[PDB]
Amino acid sequence: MSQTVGATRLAYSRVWHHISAVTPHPTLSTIKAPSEAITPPSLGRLASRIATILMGKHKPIWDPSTDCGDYVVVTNCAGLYTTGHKKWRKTYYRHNTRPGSLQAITMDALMEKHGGAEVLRKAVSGMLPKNRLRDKRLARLKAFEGDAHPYKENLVRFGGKVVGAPGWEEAVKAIREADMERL
Amino acid sequence: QSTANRTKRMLNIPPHESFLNVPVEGDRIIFNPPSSEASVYHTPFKFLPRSDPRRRANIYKLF
Amino acid sequence: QPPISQQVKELLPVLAAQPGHYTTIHIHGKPYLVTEGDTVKLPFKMPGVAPGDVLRLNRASVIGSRDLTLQGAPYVDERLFECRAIVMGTESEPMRVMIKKKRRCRKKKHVFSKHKYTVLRINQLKINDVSSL
Amino acid sequence: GGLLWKIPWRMSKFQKLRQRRRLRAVDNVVATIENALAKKGETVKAVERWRAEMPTEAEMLPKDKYTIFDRKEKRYRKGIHKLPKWTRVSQRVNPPGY
Amino acid sequence: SFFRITLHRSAIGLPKRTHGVLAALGLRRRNQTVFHPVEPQFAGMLMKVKELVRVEEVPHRLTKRELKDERKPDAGFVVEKQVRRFIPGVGVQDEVDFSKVGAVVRDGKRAGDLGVRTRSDWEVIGKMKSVLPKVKAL
Amino acid sequence: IRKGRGPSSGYGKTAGRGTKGQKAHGHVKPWFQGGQTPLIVSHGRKGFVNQFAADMSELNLE
RNA sequence: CGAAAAUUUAACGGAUCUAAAUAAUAUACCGAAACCUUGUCCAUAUGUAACAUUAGUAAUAAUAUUAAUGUUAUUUGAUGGGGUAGCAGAACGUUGAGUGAAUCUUAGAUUUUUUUUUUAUAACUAAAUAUAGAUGAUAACUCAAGUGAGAAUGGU
RNA sequence: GUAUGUCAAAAGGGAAACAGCCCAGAACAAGAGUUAAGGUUCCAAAAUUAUUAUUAAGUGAAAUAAAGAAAGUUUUUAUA
RNA sequence: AUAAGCAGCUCAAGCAAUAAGAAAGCGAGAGCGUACCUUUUGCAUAAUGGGUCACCAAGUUAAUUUUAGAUGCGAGCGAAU
Ligand SMILES: [K+]
Ligand SMILES: [K+]
Ligand SMILES: [K+]
Ligand SMILES: [Mg+2]
Ligand SMILES: [Mg+2]
Ligand SMILES: [Mg+2]
Ligand SMILES: [Mg+2]
Ligand SMILES: [Mg+2]
Ligand SMILES: [Mg+2]
Ligand SMILES: [Mg+2]
Ligand SMILES: [Mg+2]
Ligand SMILES: [Mg+2]
Ligand SMILES: [Mg+2]
Ligand SMILES: [Mg+2]
Ligand SMILES: [Mg+2]
Ligand SMILES: [Mg+2]
Ligand SMILES: [Mg+2]
Ligand SMILES: [Mg+2]
Ligand SMILES: [Mg+2]
Ligand SMILES: [Mg+2]
Ligand SMILES: [Mg+2]
Ligand SMILES: [Mg+2]
Ligand SMILES: [Mg+2]
Ligand SMILES: [Mg+2]
Ligand SMILES: [Mg+2]
Ligand SMILES: [Mg+2]
Ligand SMILES: [Mg+2]
């Protein structure tokens, strides 16, 4: 029981993560060679990763009942990477229980009214548990079409270097070497 | 779930990767700096008296 | 006995010098991560013990501190640590009733279960000095 | 029929893998029983029949590991998983030609 | 040599004859291990249930008390100190410390025989009004 | 054996009678064999009982 | 491509997937009330020791033992564990009756509740409210039944 | 009708949901325990695990629609 | 008062005692779970029966003929004198 005794303030805090839908991802890409052929994370492979963060499942204290999820700011959703002809052949449906009122729309036609952010919210929404926390978690996914967003100051940092920045890894290893100078 | 045992399995979280690398045919001391905030009882080397022999280089420099 | 590794003989003083220490004792093969002063409630009635008996635990899987961690392949050597506990008595649970029933059958068979549990108290957990070994 | 017995016509790579290991485990039971008797200079009529008219997993074609003969099918072949107790039964040889 | 036969699967949906072959082998429940000599009569008995058991040659037969000792975990504790217990059929057992080593059990029909402090022993301790600890000890 | 006093007793609902038959609703005659003729009819009764014979009380020498 | 049906995408479970498809392979992991381990309950055997009761046989003025029954522990580290129709065994509870001209009760019997503990269809501890000396209650053993109800378009 | 099993009278895991199918026979608890069928990107416990080919149609991915057509594509065997 | 629970079970934040000590109860949130009985090969079935609660309400008695166990007597038993 001692493992849990302590200050759990920072274990439950909301971290503001960031990812660009255009930056190549060696881990979430199916093409891994050559270096120039690596593609960004596909729609479903990016949503599968985000849904894991919104559920807080990346934390060692995850519990499905506690809403220990985090925020995820997705940028460049206009350049959402998709394979095949999904952009023009995939269809989204709707019905309000009135016979004949079946609304259909393609991915590209849906990206003209509400942009690529709406296509990613539907992918993440289906990957989340269908319960009373689905709308709270999906609201923590802030997707934008370009590189601009109001959370450029919220993104988690480490020594002034935003995570995902060019030199963010060096700033982390420098802070841990200073923490070892103690009993 | 239906039973308290089935719930424990669904809510399982595996131990840290450092503990899985268990030695074989021998005992060893591995260095696992946790991703957590240290308490106040880990006095920094700057507050230790000059006489305290515990003053020593970082544990990383010992490996 | 098998000599202790040279790497363990040089880093154990650093492990025993840090503020806090924990251990993963193994009672009948099952692990229990405990610290000096913790109250372990075993899920069984240990036979042949009375409140006030001292037990010497000798099967430790992992003994570590914040930064360092000693791991024995099968188990950590007994000569390195010394963990003891005291039997705090026995405790019981409230009687729970299980009703085994099938649809369209009136017979309801009852199962009354009320198990006892042995409660321990870790009163000593220290790391020995192996300067001589 | 209106009663749904949802059984796919083909097996998955996970079922085919376990099938390979079951065909491989029965080969070790006959090899152990045969080698144990050979050391004593003995023989069993059932063990001599198996080694004579039954192949090993390393000698069977993929179509004999995941399929069986069925005269009611278009091409006289039927998924082996459509056999009763197919997991605890031996089936390795089909009629010649089919 | 012997056959170390272990029942890996069940026969809940196999013909009745398959149960007769498992009963003759002695495999009542799952993962149960039995030892039979290497003979044609036992060999052919395993060819009928070869899809359910795991066979293996062993030099000797393991007794019943030796088959269960290989799945038994180490207790992980050793009683080094005991308190005064009353055994129903043996009498009062005085406290013992195994670390400094003595199970002495005193029985009788009088309190003095049990070896415990009685009311008589408590009155002599109160009348020793002259006992005093050393000056340095205070 | 008190029948009709719950399921756990073992004789609760039908009291060991079965389910909706003639043996559960009413009574079956003892001499009834389903309609098939008994043997005492297909064969007939044999002999007569002597009502005039004396019933001696036997006594042996031993 | 052939391939068209009437509430709605409409037999990938869904999101989605260029494999997270398909074919031929390899390994690790997950995975049931299955199995294992540590304990518990119940049933049925095998010996031994001890505790209690009942009834016998001995001993005792200067306690031992035999048999039955109940119970706990222990030996073989004993064996066994779904269940309808149905069969069988062992118990509890309810009503009245005998021992009973008995036992207990203002130092609180009895109080349809609440609470507490015990392997627990039951009883028990305590608390609160009221106030009975017997037309009150009651253990234990035994006797006899108008003896146990979520089910009958049941009856009041 | 016959042969075998299950259901009936059998809970539990898998087959999205499921009397009869694949596993497995529930006395009660504990365990990142060991396994069967089955599975391991997310819903949802576990591989976005390795190797070699094919498909570009979301074909298909846990209920194979047919004959048949065709400079779709790949391989192999011939052949210029 | 953003939610689609045969209202129970598994996990469980939080609230709850003016005070030393002492947490019953209610429970957000996560998961599992389609009443009961009857009758049927098979029923959540849109098959039968019940508005709820309390009470009444169903293998009993007699004679006769058997079996088992226990026990009395015993080539006699029982009854009655
Ligand atoms: K009926
Ligand atoms: K499709
Ligand atoms: K009645
Ligand atoms: Mg249908
Ligand atoms: Mg019955
Ligand atoms: Mg009957
Ligand atoms: Mg009867
Ligand atoms: Mg009948
Ligand atoms: Mg679909
Ligand atoms: Mg079991
Ligand atoms: Mg069983
Ligand atoms: Mg009252
Ligand atoms: Mg009366
Ligand atoms: Mg009624
Ligand atoms: Mg059966
Ligand atoms: Mg029936
Ligand atoms: Mg079933
Ligand atoms: Mg599935
Ligand atoms: Mg595991
Ligand atoms: Mg997962
Ligand atoms: Mg609300
Ligand atoms: Mg019908
Ligand atoms: Mg109805
Ligand atoms: Mg009605
Ligand atoms: Mg009414
Ligand atoms: Mg009345
Ligand atoms: Mg009545």
Side-chain angles (χ1 to χ4, degrees):
Chain A
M1 177 176 290
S2 55
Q3 308 117 300
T4 57
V5 179
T8 78
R9 300 159 184 162
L10 317 187
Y12 276 104
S13 66
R14 316 283 195 190
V15 180
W16 288 77
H17 309 285
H18 173 252
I19 185 167
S20 184
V22 172
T23 307
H25 211 292
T27 311
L28 290 173
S29 70
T30 44
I31 310 300
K32 285 174 171 54
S35 158
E36 57 265 11
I38 297 168
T39 65
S42 196
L43 161 59
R45 314 223 169 194
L46 172 56
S48 179
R49 173 55 169 171
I50 290 165
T52 308
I53 309 306
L54 302 181
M55 281 186 290
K57 216 146 187 164
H58 63 289
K59 307 180 179 181
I61 59 136
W62 162 83
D63 189 79
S65 89
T66 71
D67 198 339
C68 56
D70 296 341
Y71 292 94
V72 189
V73 185
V74 193
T75 54
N76 293 317
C77 280
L80 216 65
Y81 174 68
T82 43
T83 54
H85 293 288
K86 299 165 177 288
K87 206 198 204 75
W88 311 278
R89 306 198 188 188
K90 171 149 186 159
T91 318
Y92 303 84
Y93 296 97
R94 249 175 49 202
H95 218 295
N96 67 341
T97 71
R98 173 162 182 164
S101 301
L102 173 66
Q103 302 277 325
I105 195 172
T106 49
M107 187 185 292
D108 66 325
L110 179 60
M111 289 171 75
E112 293 163 8
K113 312 179 72 168
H114 307 102
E118 174 53 28
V119 171
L120 182 62
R121 271 193 299 274
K122 292 201 185 307
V124 173
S125 182
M127 297 177 189
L128 290 166
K130 321 303 178 108
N131 60 33
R132 309 199 177 194
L133 304 176
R134 191 182 173 188
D135 276 325
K136 281 194 176 183
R137 289 160 164 166
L138 186 65
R140 311 213 179 87
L141 165 57
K142 269 75 177 190
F144 293 93
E145 300 304 83
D147 306 74
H149 52 103
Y151 317 105
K152 287 181 171 176
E153 294 178 20
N154 304 36
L155 310 189
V156 65
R157 291 169 171 72
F158 285 102
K161 301 293 189 179
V162 177
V163 172
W168 83 273
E169 266 163 327
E170 305 175 16
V172 173
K173 294 188 175 185
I175 297 167
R176 312 304 165 204
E177 290 179 345
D179 301 359
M180 310 313 307
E181 286 174 341
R182 50 172 167 75
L183 298 177
Chain B
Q1 295 290 318
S2 79
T3 66
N5 213 338
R6 291 184 174 185
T7 311
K8 196 198 178 195
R9 310 202 205 94
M10 282 289 181
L11 309 180
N12 187 55
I13 292 165
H16 201 245
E17 292 274 29
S18 67
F19 296 101
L20 303 183
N21 195 339
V22 73
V24 176
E25 301 287 350
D27 309 4
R28 65 185 185 190
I29 287 170
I30 57 173
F31 174 58
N32 312 137
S35 172
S36 62
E37 196 174 21
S39 63
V40 296
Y41 300 94
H42 294 82
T43 307
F45 298 156
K46 204 155 197 167
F47 295 161
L48 300 177
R50 297 169 297 114
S51 44
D52 197 328
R54 289 187 299 176
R55 186 185 278 90
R56 166 181 37 67
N58 309 20
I59 297 167
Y60 168 48
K61 304 179 190 306
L62 308 175
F63 269 63
Chain C
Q1 273 212 10
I4 58 174
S5 158
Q6 181 60 21
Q7 182 267 2
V8 177
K9 187 174 176 178
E10 295 177 16
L11 280 161
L12 197 75
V14 181
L15 181 73
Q18 276 189 287
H21 307 84
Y22 72 96
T23 188
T24 307
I25 55 165
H26 278 246
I27 312 302
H28 291 295
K30 306 288 169 52
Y32 300 105
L33 199 153
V34 302
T35 63
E36 195 190 63
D38 288 3
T39 304
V40 188
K41 178 173 172 177
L42 304 167
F44 66 94
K45 193 186 182 301
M46 184 174 291
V49 296
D53 299 330
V54 182
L55 317 170
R56 185 174 59 78
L57 319 177
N58 48 26
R59 290 287 172 281
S61 157
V62 174
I63 294 156
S65 63
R66 170 167 177 78
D67 277 359
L68 296 164
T69 307
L70 168 60
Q71 306 183 345
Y75 286 111
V76 177
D77 191 7
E78 308 178 18
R79 301 179 295 173
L80 305 175
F81 78 104
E82 280 190 359
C83 188
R84 280 167 176 73
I86 190 163
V87 179
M88 298 283 288
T90 302
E91 282 198 24
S92 200
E93 57 157 11
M95 169 150 285
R96 40 178 183 80
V97 190
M98 163 171 282
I99 293 161
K100 296 150 159 291
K101 201 196 177 306
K102 300 262 159 41
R103 287 169 133 86
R104 290 164 285 283
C105 180
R106 294 175 186 178
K107 178 146 164 41
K108 305 170 67 176
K109 203 187 78 178
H110 302 268
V111 195
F112 305 93
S113 303
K114 182 166 180 177
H115 302 326
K116 276 61 169 182
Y117 307 116
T118 298
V119 190
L120 302 179
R121 169 74 87 168
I122 313 309
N123 55 14
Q124 193 205 41
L125 166 53
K126 89 189 193 178
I127 300 166
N128 303 340
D129 184 7
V130 293
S131 299
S132 158
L133 278 64
Chain D
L3 195 64
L4 176 47
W5 293 108
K6 225 169 117 174
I7 308 172
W9 66 277
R10 52 178 169 188
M11 295 154 52
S12 58
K13 60 188 177 187
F14 313 113
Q15 298 185 25
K16 295 179 174 173
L17 177 61
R18 291 184 289 274
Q19 171 67 358
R20 271 168 259 151
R21 297 176 166 173
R22 285 193 302 267
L23 296 162
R24 191 178 303 153
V26 172
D27 301 359
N28 300 20
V29 168
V30 182
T32 309
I33 293 164
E34 185 182 49
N35 296 332
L37 294 157
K39 291 165 184 170
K40 290 193 174 185
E42 302 166 1
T43 41
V44 173
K45 198 169 265 58
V47 179
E48 291 176 338
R49 184 192 167 194
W50 182 266
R51 301 290 302 110
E53 51 161 271
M54 295 294 287
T56 60
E57 191 274 339
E59 302 166 354
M60 293 166 62
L61 298 172
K63 85 196 223 303
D64 281 320
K65 310 181 185 185
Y66 323 120
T67 326
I68 43 170
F69 168 72
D70 187 13
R71 67 188 63 203
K72 298 192 278 75
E73 301 289 332
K74 267 299 308 189
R75 303 308 309 162
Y76 304 87
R77 278 285 166 169
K78 178 213 217 185
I80 194 165
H81 64 294
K82 307 236 186 177
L83 183 75
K85 328 298 170 168
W86 76 286
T87 289
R88 303 169 290 175
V89 172
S90 283
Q91 166 58 41
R92 315 192 173 192
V93 176
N94 290 281
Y98 297 103
Chain E
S1 44
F2 291 74
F3 279 135
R4 176 155 183 165
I5 308 131
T6 306
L7 182 58
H8 177 53
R9 312 297 298 279
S10 88
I12 290 162
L14 306 180
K16 182 178 72 185
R17 186 180 295 268
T18 313
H19 294 257
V21 177
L22 291 168
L25 282 163
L27 302 157
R28 196 166 204 176
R29 67 206 75 261
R30 200 162 142 277
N31 288 318
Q32 172 171 341
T33 302
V34 300
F35 294 84
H36 287 298
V38 172
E39 299 171 347
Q41 61 195 352
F42 294 108
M45 202 174 289
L46 299 166
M47 287 294 296
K48 293 273 188 167
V49 294
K50 59 185 169 297
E51 296 88 20
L52 317 171
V53 299
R54 291 182 171 183
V55 195
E56 188 189 7
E57 311 175 27
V58 298
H60 323 287
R61 182 202 297 273
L62 291 181
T63 43
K64 175 178 164 191
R65 199 177 191 282
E66 198 165 0
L67 240 188
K68 188 153 188 171
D69 276 9
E70 48 167 293
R71 297 186 304 280
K72 189 183 185 181
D74 308 329
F77 61 92
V78 182
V79 184
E80 62 174 40
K81 189 208 174 190
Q82 287 184 335
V83 297
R84 221 204 312 277
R85 324 191 176 188
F86 157 62
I87 309 168
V90 199
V92 182
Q93 185 211 265
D94 212 337
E95 56 183 69
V96 57
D97 196 332
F98 300 89
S99 66
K100 314 311 193 310
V101 179
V104 57
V105 196
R106 305 190 192 81
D107 190 3
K109 213 175 87 167
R110 295 197 304 282
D113 303 0
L114 302 176
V116 302
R117 218 184 308 278
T118 67
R119 273 195 173 83
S120 302
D121 293 329
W122 270 126
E123 187 165 351
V124 298
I125 290 163
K127 289 180 175 178
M128 287 194 300
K129 304 184 181 185
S130 45
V131 177
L132 190 77
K134 291 179 74 181
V135 177
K136 54 166 282 299
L138 272 191
Chain F
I1 296 162
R2 287 184 69 221
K3 307 171 190 168
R5 295 300 189 281
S8 277
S9 63
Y11 311 90
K13 188 168 64 158
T14 59
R17 283 227 186 197
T19 323
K20 59 152 71 179
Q22 181 163 18
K23 299 193 79 181
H25 292 144
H27 183 48
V28 180
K29 304 293 185 173
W31 45 262
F32 195 64
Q33 311 189 20
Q36 189 183 290
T37 52
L39 294 187
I40 194 130
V41 173
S42 63
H43 295 149
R45 193 174 290 95
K46 195 210 182 188
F48 74 108
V49 183
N50 201 336
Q51 305 296 340
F52 299 94
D55 203 15
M56 293 278 143
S57 84
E58 297 156 3
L59 172 60
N60 294 270
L61 289 170
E62 64 173 15

